[PDB]
Design a protein around this ligand. Structure first.
Ligand code: NAD
Ligand code: NAD
Ligand code: UDP
Ligand code: UDP
Lengths: 314, 314
């Protein structure tokens, strides 16, 4: 089958392409405009192995300018990961690119899929739609985003439901929870903190560091994401959380990094970022039931993998 | 008290300004860009009736091209009605104006209101955020829009929540259910059916006519809207349905119009429109508690008042 992966040069997209191309029966088309927080130099590094594979076609174009008829021709499955991520930079004049790349891109892809015969349109969304919630969050919970980023991602999901119900586009929504590992974007906490610790520079903590996340190792995320394509059971119209093995605070993470490096971190405590929840915590019962999803990578192992990646990168 | 009304030249905004100007204490500033489905000659008449009153100031500008800081310095209350409406015409290349005027306009107003001292930011939303449910919908129900229009309006609501929680903007959300009466937009059902019945033409019905609406007479909508300003209760942060006295199907409305005109009408049944709900039905429990809201205008009285307006308009 032929699979389109949007945002194929990004953190998660590049890994997903690599995992799909392990199946010799799969051909992948990747499209990426090299925008968002990650410098082009890092994205080039993300796709260098992919571009050698004869079953990978790479298109460096904006989805809003590209020929979507040409892009979607004989596509069987769409993985839509293209987006602008980032809570802090989603305020004031920085908001327009979130609207353009998270809302308009999703509408224009879904429009182009109306007369195509897809098996699946697998739309990647975020735990950021939930906002500030207590306990493990299930997919039937009323989302109240806390950031403009989260609002634009939730509008994407809502467009998926619109095109599903009206035009029978076979949508599946995955909500990822803070993904980390090799190739993590340089604006995310583990990349920043590891880079800072390697350079013997202060570790930047937003707020007091007691905030927690459901951190999801990249190989766990990708196993869940591939399972959504490979299942034969009807998951069309479903929203599925994809979460991690072990939750932790930023202080817990820094302690674990200090154990890996054998260094002691200098900490700088900055003001809390408006729009960030204090806690995220997935209920992954539904992914367990529908996808046989079970995350298996510990934080200690995942963090050493990212630590090694960042050290080698710089 | 000085009140900014966005979309002041429109159907509901012109009525809202009219009602506020009846209170000598209130100074009103209307802003309208003359865009959306209604031709600018009908909106000229709206602004002309308001401009009779010395306590009314009109600004003919796009909200995205105005010095909002300067405009808002002396504003106590914002009523935000400016939007592109239209469930039916929000598809394909028509979608971008919905995103620009329903999402970016809301974000930019909220941004300008961050450091203003406002009593209240009263944001007007729509039953179109809900999509499809069995009985009367509560404001706490998980909304899944059926139309791109609905997605854009729900994104505006979510932007209100984000700015309320992060910057303490005193937001109130009103979800209107299909508003009708004198000055109703020409693209809405009652305007079209009345005009068609007056001109002895086939009544155009999109689907089988068994669609039903919680039709809200304009004077009832405006009484609940003014009560959001004047209520003794604390409603900051609340979402409040504003619905009508009597629910009816389009077939039911046609029989009531036949009663009023003293004519038998010719029906033209057309294709159902994608993105429209089959039923809308507000639970107005919350408006009754928080706003003392009770709709008083029957369909027979309201349709007669709209009939008289349409007969005079052409
Ligand atoms: N990384 C996480 O922790 C996380 C958590 C939740 C959800 N997500 C979601 O997962 C997806 C992937 O995230 P990521 O961390 O890999 O981000 P990323 O920035 O590394 O990758 C996304 C890619 O999308 C591309 N893109 C954006 N707009 C485009 C457009 N108009 N045309 C073409 N390409 C465009 C960018 O160039 C970028 O390489 C996103 O949808 C994000 O919202 C990620
Ligand atoms: N009429 C209904 O039945 C109904 C039902 C539910 C909700 N609503 C909501 O009520 C509000 C008013 O609806 P209406 O029927 O009076 O519509 P309308 O089109 O008559 O009025 C809206 C006005 O907003 C103005 N506007 C749009 N974008 C603008 C911008 N960028 N700058 C300045 N002005 C701008 C337009 O020129 C227009 O006059 C809208 O928010 C709509 O979503 C209406
Ligand atoms: O340099 C940093 C970057 C992020 N964070 C915090 O680390 C957490 C995780 O952020 P990350 O960017 O990993 O993922 P997010 O949860 O935003 O998707 C958030 O609470 C941020 O407040 C931090 O303390 N220092
Ligand atoms: O000429 C028309 C216009 C509208 N409608 C239908 O009338 C209902 C009410 O549409 P209106 O525009 O009044 O309000 P909406 O509910 O879209 O805000 C919808 O089911 C439309 O499909 C119709 O049958 N004929």
């Amino acid at each position: 089958m032929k699979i389109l992966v949007t945002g194929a040069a990004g953190f998660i997209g590049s890994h997903l392409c690599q995992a799909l191309l392990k199946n010799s029966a799969y051909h992948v088309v990747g499209i990426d405009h090299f925008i968002g927080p990650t410098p082009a130099t890092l994205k080039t590094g993300n796709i260098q192995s992919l571009e050698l594979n004869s079953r990978f076609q790479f298109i460096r174009e904006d989805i809003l300018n590209t020929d979507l008829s040409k892009l979607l021709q004989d596509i069987d499955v769409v993985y839509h990961l293209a987006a602008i991520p980032g809570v802090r930079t989603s305020w004031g004049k920085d908001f327009q690119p979130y609207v353009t790349n998270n809302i308009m891109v999703t509408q224009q892809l879904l429009e182009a899929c109306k007369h195509i015969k897809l098996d699946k349109f697998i739309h990647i969304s975020t735990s950021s739609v939930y906002g500030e919630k207590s306990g493990a969050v299930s997919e039937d919970l009323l989302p109240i985003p806390l950031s403009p980023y989260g609002v634009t991602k939730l509008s994407g999901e809502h467009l998926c439901h619109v095109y599903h119900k009206n035009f029978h586009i076979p949508i599946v929504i995955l909500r990822y929870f803070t993904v980390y590992g090799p190739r993590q974007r340089p604006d995310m906490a583990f990349h920043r903190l590891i880079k800072q610790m390697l350079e013997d520079k202060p570790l930047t903590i937003f707020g007091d560091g007691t905030q927690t996340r459901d951190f999801t190792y990249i190989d766990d995320c990708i196993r869940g994401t591939v399972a959504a394509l490979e299942t034969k059971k009807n998951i069309i119209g479903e929203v599925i959380n994809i979460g991690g093995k072990e939750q932790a605070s930023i202080l817990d993470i820094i302690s674990m990094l200090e154990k890996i490096s054998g260094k002691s971190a200098t900490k700088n405590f900055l003001k809390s970022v408006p729009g960030e929840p204090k806690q995220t915590w997935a209920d992954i019962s539904k992914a367990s039931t529908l996808l046989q999803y079970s995350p298996t990578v510990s934080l200690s192992d995942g963090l050493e993998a990212e630590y090694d990646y960042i050290k080698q990168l710089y």
